[PDB]
């Protein structure tokens, strides 16, 4: 029978008896309802509006099987020491999402449940992908294990640099700075996230001179060198056109900003990278607009998960100690989530769901953002071996130049890796290893004296 009118959201959307299926997408929401609204109604409205939900009863509902396709809330868990704050668990059937599309899974769940009059704040904490849905995606073009085989580099973390200033340098001067860094002993160099194709330096000029700088540096040292060329462009055609020219110059690696350009563009490029055998570095520009606040937005672990499915060989995870925000317990959570095949559920770490990847390759973690020679033993112990450490100002800001600055970082890293392998704690003897290595190398001794006093210590907004 058909009854026209206004139905309560709690009636046929909140079911506590329901048990989640193995082929089901699960989401964890942190909800803050308006005063005078029940916990169940707030959870039901999020579950309804995201999938098959409408403010009034419609007759067309009876033609379809509503019970099969509806999203439902199965559990409500209240937040300790907080009034009008609860964790909602919502199940979504597998059949309603498009295959191999991050855009669909994003537009469906976090489409318009945010900005609802009935609730003041909402935050998506963690999402669970089943094995059946993961198999439709390509994933990373190469992954950790394939990348190390192509680069022929084993035993240590990789070293990188960012050219400064961000804007102003000529195409010829840019290549000179690239050459001097790679000559010293760094594996990679990087373009800034904002560098694309400005009036002062055009992209095709930058690509040509950088290629000459690598060619000289590789033949001199006897080691494979690279540079992440920024492919981010106004249109999908211009993006692919810049990538083609990097392939023509025989470049091993290119970079892209996934959030500002969007997931549609990032999926296109990652598929292209697979077909042409090019490694793909991913910058997380504009992330902190979304993931900063503890009450509203989407946590980064969800954005990290979505990138692994879309495609990417490297990802910025952020330094624990440095100029930008980071929390050790939270960071080690999503870093182990991108690198490992199987991750166990851990509430203190921040992981709400047991995530299982079906033989999908891991993504290399990038630690960057205001780090010098003293932070080296702390970074190595936290991030491990399968990571990239990048020094922008730490390399170029050396009193003697780029090449002695690049040697200073390389000596500091290899001295710590050697000490770790011997059987020494880097948390206890971190200062000692750096100090004893600075006796036989003059470049390290100068760099240690300069950035001794500098320490970034501030309160973090996002907490467990």
């Amino acid at each position: 029978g058909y009854k026209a009118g206004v139905q309560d959201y709690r009636l046929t959307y909140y079911t506590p008896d329901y048990t989640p299926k193995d082929t089901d997408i699960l989401a964890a929401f942190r909800v803050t309802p308006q005063p005078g609204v029940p916990f169940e109604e707030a959870a039901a409205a999020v579950a309804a509006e995201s999938s098959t939900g409408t403010w009034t009863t419609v007759w067309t509902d009876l033609l379809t099987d509503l019970d099969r396709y509806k999203g439902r809330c199965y559990d409500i868990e209240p937040v300790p020491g907080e009034d009008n704050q609860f964790i909602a668990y919502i199940a979504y059937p597998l059949d309603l999402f498009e295959e191999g599309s991050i855009t669909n899974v994003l537009t469906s769940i976090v489409g318009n449940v945010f900005g609802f009059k009935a609730l003041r704040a909402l935050r998506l904490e963690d999402i669970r992908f089943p094995v059946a849905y993961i198999k439709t995606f390509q994933g990373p073009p190469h992954g950790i294990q394939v990348e190390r085989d192509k680069l022929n580099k084993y035993g240590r973390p990789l070293l990188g640099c960012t050219i400064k200033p961000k804007l102003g340098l000529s195409a010829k001067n840019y290549g000179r700075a690239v050459y001097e860094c790679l000559r010293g002993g760094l594996d990679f160099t990087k373009d800034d996230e904002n560098i694309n194709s400005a009036p002062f330096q055009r992209w095709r000029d930058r690509f040509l001179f950088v290629a000459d700088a690598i060619t000289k540096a590789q033949a001199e040292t006897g080691e494979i060198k690279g540079h992440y060329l920024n492919v981010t462009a106004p249109t999908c055609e211009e993006m692919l056109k810049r990538a083609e020219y990097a392939k023509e110059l025989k470049q091993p690696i290119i970079m892209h900003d996934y959030l500002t350009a969007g997931f549609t563009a990032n999926t296109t490029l990652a598929r292209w990278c697979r077909d042409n055998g090019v490694l793909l570095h991913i910058h997380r520009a504009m992330h902190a607009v979304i993931d900063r606040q503890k009450n509203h937005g989407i946590h980064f672990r969800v954005l990290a998960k979505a990138l692994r499915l879309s495609g990417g060989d490297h990802i910025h995870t952020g330094t624990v100690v440095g100029k930008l925000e980071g929390e050790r317990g939270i960071t080690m959570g999503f870093v182990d989530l991108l690198r490992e095949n199987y991750v166990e559920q851990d509430k203190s770490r921040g992981i709400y769901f047991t995530q299982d990847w079906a033989s999908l390759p891991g993504v290399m973690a990038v630690a960057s953002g205001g780090i010098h020679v003293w932070h080296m033993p702390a970074l190595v112990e936290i991030f491990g071996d399968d990571s990239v450490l990048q020094f922008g100002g730490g390399t170029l800001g050396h009193p003697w130049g780029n090449a002695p600055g690049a040697t200073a970082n390389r000596v500091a890293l290899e001295a710590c890796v050697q000490a770790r392998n011997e059987g020494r704690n880097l948390a206890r003897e971190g200062n000692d290893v750096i100090r004893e290595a600075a006796k036989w190398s003059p470049e390290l001794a100068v760099a240690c004296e300069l950035w001794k006093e500098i320490k970034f210590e501030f309160e973090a907004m996002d907490t467990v």
């Binding site: 294990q145 190390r148 085989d149 084993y154 035993g155 000559r183 002993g185 040697t407 290899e414």
Partner: protein
Amino acid sequence: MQTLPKERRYETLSYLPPLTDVQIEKQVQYILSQGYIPAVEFNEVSEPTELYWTLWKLPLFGAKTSREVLAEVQSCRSQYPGHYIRVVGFDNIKQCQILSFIVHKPSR
């Protein structure tokens, strides 16, 4: 101020001062304590382009002590003085090389 001299480098642990026999023994001991398979590789010339080196005998699957590995290095060194020699460590679970370092350079 000082200008950096031009020098050819050999991947991992090539920036540190040359490894003593005690230091190499400690690096091999690390490989065995974790549970990885040690192996000896040799080549005529060291280049960034080439990624395969000639395998000396077979990977040591049945290694009990680090002295056994050092004995295989000494055998390859006496047989080939004018060749580069490196020690590599294979992992079976992850299916990737954990450690790689050069122990011998062509003598004069």
